Design a protein around this ligand. Structure first.
Ligand SMILES: Nc1ccn([C@H]2C[C@H](O)[C@@H](COP(=O)(O)O)O2)c(=O)n1
Ligand SMILES: Nc1ccn([C@H]2C[C@H](O)[C@@H](COP(=O)(O)O)O2)c(=O)n1
Ligand SMILES: [Ca+2]
Ligand SMILES: [Ca+2]
Ligand SMILES: [Zn+2]
Ligand SMILES: [Zn+2]
Ligand SMILES: [Zn+2]
Ligand SMILES: [Zn+2]
Lengths: 524, 524
């Protein structure tokens, strides 16, 4: 029996440095986790001990911290090269800076094959990108070979910025011919590595004949066999076993997100590339594992430009930006307005005759706003100032909510109004009126929202059964601040850019900002 | 007796081409007027016939049409050089593009002296600008000499962009020492040429001993002796005679604006530079005077880059920009909102602890809006598209209005509502509610306006006695659309940038716009 050890990461999302336990800035070293230096240590230990090792990444290295802001994927090529990744599948966020922002920093600099079988190019882009990513790669491992076939979420054109000369085909339709092609090269050991989410990964396991193992991403899925080592709650066993339509047992794995774990799966194969068995579990990269000193020092050197950048002027405010709790927890505050205006301004997508913009509405819990910004420093705003206001390392995500759900959110906003609790909502694209003299749960007396299906944006009454796209913090999408109805009733949830990045981009675009308190929220 | 003929222009405001009768785009050639080609013809005729001629400009060549937008004052140097101006005084608008935007295009390229006695520099600017403008110049004319001393409105730092290293001193205080200095050079014939307005010009005539003639600007003053040749109504005789405190008769002249007239004054001087008499009148530059073919052809060559520029993308809209009369004459329309947002965004001036911005409020008569803009041309907006919306060649000006006046304007807005008349107001920085069921004159039921003296902008009720700064079309400032109360009751009026330029600058800044109908105007 020939044994393969698959080490794998997915949705690292620019967590090049070690993080806190919930994947934000590392504050208390003794409780910090992940980062590429620690991952280096663990990979190097395993590669010392085990004969046949592949280190794979299932996409979404791009986007998530100031690393990506400053280095735009050059940090991904550099550190992935240093860790000697064996292959990577493209994810949705690898198109965030467009095709050009993928070809250069990543495709041209990676020292390992980057894979996707279901993306095809045309127009002049076809010539520019030809051969710079591949449907599959056959890799020598020990004395054997392993084929790896890649795939990328077919939703990518709605989520990111691939442009109009890339077509994203159905994953299963695209993969089958490639796997058939591998069979014809006498490749009998096949990994599907790709970035479409656990539910798609299971379908690939079931339906794509010849696939031996699926290594996936995109859904931040945590799989574990046994007691969970940290706070993530498993979505299922590791590996998750799919019974394929050809009656094989196909293991499916993922390793959460943010570089906190190193996926580790051992597969025993017989002479004909059939899986005898497979077992393993993600490894929690906690502080018991030392950060490799060399990679740490290189990280520290790369961090000099980030620190520099963090204190430069992004743009100016001519107004005090009132992020005080005494305002933002009690009434409309102009810092809430700025953040929402920035959320809506980020990622505009228009379709003639269809929508002026795909999203028009924003909500933001006042407790998420953690500082004002003073305008009397020559009006300068820096990334560091924005980090005081938004210090949690979160994202601004897009969800789809029924009107009824959002009406419940706005009742929750004021259900125990007056105690300075964090749940009071700042808004954009929404005009709400409350009457606090009404019973809790019945205080929203007017709730109008900006149309999307219109050529001229205007405000209409919220409709209980209609589904609205809303940008809001990942904190709220996950039901924080007691917004359980959002978590439980949302119909879709896509993760977006890092919170600070969204606001900094808007400020840099606008050059000079002056958000006002203008009657988005009123009390009768 | 030695006779001097002073030809003079002021406040030409970028009217390099011939104009209509009210100084807008020339449509019907047979009724077009001014422009530098026609002015060339007239100046050349007078210089053939009269021995001792100076051609002077009293400032504000900068700003007013796409000429200045594209060529940024290089068109001023070029054409003023071609006409062989003898001297020019700096006006307020010559600082519109900052000190750098004056030094280069104009100061370094003019082939005539540029004058101002009351502007002084310090810091590193003092070294950069030293000698590039002068307090005075002594010019040979025939066998004699004439001293010309310049001055510039002391209000310039509030009106334009001179920066903090220029100090603008009181005009009379500054001029006296210079005129004293000219006396000590045996210069007995002295013209004060400068840019502070007719009322200041009269005070200079009265108070600055040794000044023989004042040639002024800034107030667009039309002076005429006899029947007016066109539609401008004279503010007084030409020349206007001031009796100086030394008991001389000092003629004061101006020649309206926009290059429509050539000021022409003849002064007879005795042996000791005393004015025996003076007489003349501005010459209407109507179509009876041919445009000089050579200057016309040069104008036509310069116009190629303007036409090119006029069809380039300034930026994009993702919304239909509803400038239809059926909207903008009846209710809030998003094109009205865009224009007002652009008016407020233009010329931000902040003072810590004093005001977030000097102005927060805009009104715009719906009849001034003359086209929508369709977003389905790839969202592109061009200068040509903006010229369909704003075709009158007007400016967006700043006035100071009491609350009572503005409440009267808003009653006028709806006094005969429902007939699609042009006076209905689009707004910015104002939340108005009307109740059309009330009697005319009593229909405004709520009128809230954005504070200026505040660090966080918010809306407060309008106060009848308080004075508000409002940006609005020069059309309205002059009482158009029956807004007689604005003309009659305003406390101050400063003329700003060309209407199209203001909107194009904003669109270029924003890159992608999406103005909404959002409840700035409501009906109860
Ligand atoms: N990642 C996080 C963590 C906390 N919060 C918010 C929830 C509460 O509104 C506030 C913390 O409550 P308090 O400031 O009252 O301790 O922070 C947030 O928005 N995002
Ligand atoms: N320089 C000008 C000339 C006209 N108008 C406005 C006044 C009226 O609102 C409209 C002309 O009225 P109508 O379109 O009903 O003829 O144009 C303007 O705003 N500026
Ligand atoms: Ca196999
Ligand atoms: Ca004299
Ligand atoms: Zn991801
Ligand atoms: Zn993803
Ligand atoms: Zn002027
Ligand atoms: Zn002026």
């Amino acid at each position: 029996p020939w044994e393969l050890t698959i080490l794998h990461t997915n949705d690292v999302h620019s967590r090049l440095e070690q993080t806190s336990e919930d994947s934000s800035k590392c504050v208390d070293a003794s409780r910090c986790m992940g980062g590429v230096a620690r991952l280096f240590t663990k990979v190097q230990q395993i590669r010392r001990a085990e004969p046949n090792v592949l280190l794979l990444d299932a996409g979404d290295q791009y986007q998530g911290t100031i690393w990506f802001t400053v280095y735009k994927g050059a940090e991904v090529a550099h550190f992935m090269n240093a860790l000697r990744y064996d292959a990577m599948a493209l994810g949705n966020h690898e198109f965030d800076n467009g095709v050009e922002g993928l070809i250069e920093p990543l495709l041209k600099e990676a020292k390992f094959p980057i894979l996707s079988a279901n993306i095809s190019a045309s127009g002049p882009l076809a010539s520019q990108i030809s051969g710079l990513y591949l449907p599959y790669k056959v890799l020598p491992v020990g004395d054997e070979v392993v084929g790896i076939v890649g795939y990328t979420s077919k939703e990518t054109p709605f989520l990111s910025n691939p442009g109009t000369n890339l077509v994203f085909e159905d994953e299963i339709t695209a993969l089958q011919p490639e796997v058939d092609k591998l069979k014809t090269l006498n490749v009998n050991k096949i990994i599907a590595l790709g970035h479409s989410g656990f539910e798609m990964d299971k379908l690939i396991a079931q339906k794509v004949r010849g696939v031996d193992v699926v290594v996936g991403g995109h859904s931040n899925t945590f799989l574990y066999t046994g007691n969970p080592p940290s706070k993530e709650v498993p979505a299922g066993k590791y590996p998750f076993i799919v019974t394929s339509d050809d009656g094989r047992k196909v293991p499916v794995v993922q390793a959460y997100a943010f570089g906190k774990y190193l996926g580790y799966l051992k597969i025993e194969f017989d002479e004909r590339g059939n899986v005898i068995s497979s077992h393993g579990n993600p490894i929690l990269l906690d502080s018991s594992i030392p950060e490799d000193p060399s990679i740490k020092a290189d990280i520290n050197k790369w961090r000099i430009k980030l620190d520099d950048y963090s204190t430069q002027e992004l743009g100016k405010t001519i107004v005090y930006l009132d992020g005080s709790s005494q305002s933002c927890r009690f009434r409309e505050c102009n810092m809430g307005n700025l953040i929402c205006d920035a959320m809506i301004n980020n990622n505009l997508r228009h379709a003639d005759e269809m929508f002026w913009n795909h999203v028009s509405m924003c909500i933001l819990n006042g407790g998420g706003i953690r500082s004002p910004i003073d305008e009397r420093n020559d009006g300068t705003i820096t990334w560091e100032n924005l980090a005081a206001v938004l210090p949690f390392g979160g994202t601004f995500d897009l969800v789809q909510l029924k009107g009824s759900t959002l009406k419940k959110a706005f009742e929750h906003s004021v259900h125990r109004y007056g105690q300075s609790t964090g749940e009071f909502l700042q808004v954009g694209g929404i005009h709400v009126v409350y009457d606090l003299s009404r019973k809790p749960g019945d205080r929203v007396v007017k709730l109008d929202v900006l149309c999307t299906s219109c050529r001229v944006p205007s405000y209409d009454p919220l409709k209980m059964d209609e589904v609205y796209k809303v940008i809001l913090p990942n904190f709220l999408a996950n039901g924080g601040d007691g917004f359980q109805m959002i978590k439980d009733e949302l119909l879709r949830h896509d993760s977006g850019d890092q919170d600070i990045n969204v606001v900094s981009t808007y400020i840099s675009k606008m050059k000079v900002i002056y958000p006002a308190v203008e009657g988005r929220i009123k009390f009768s």
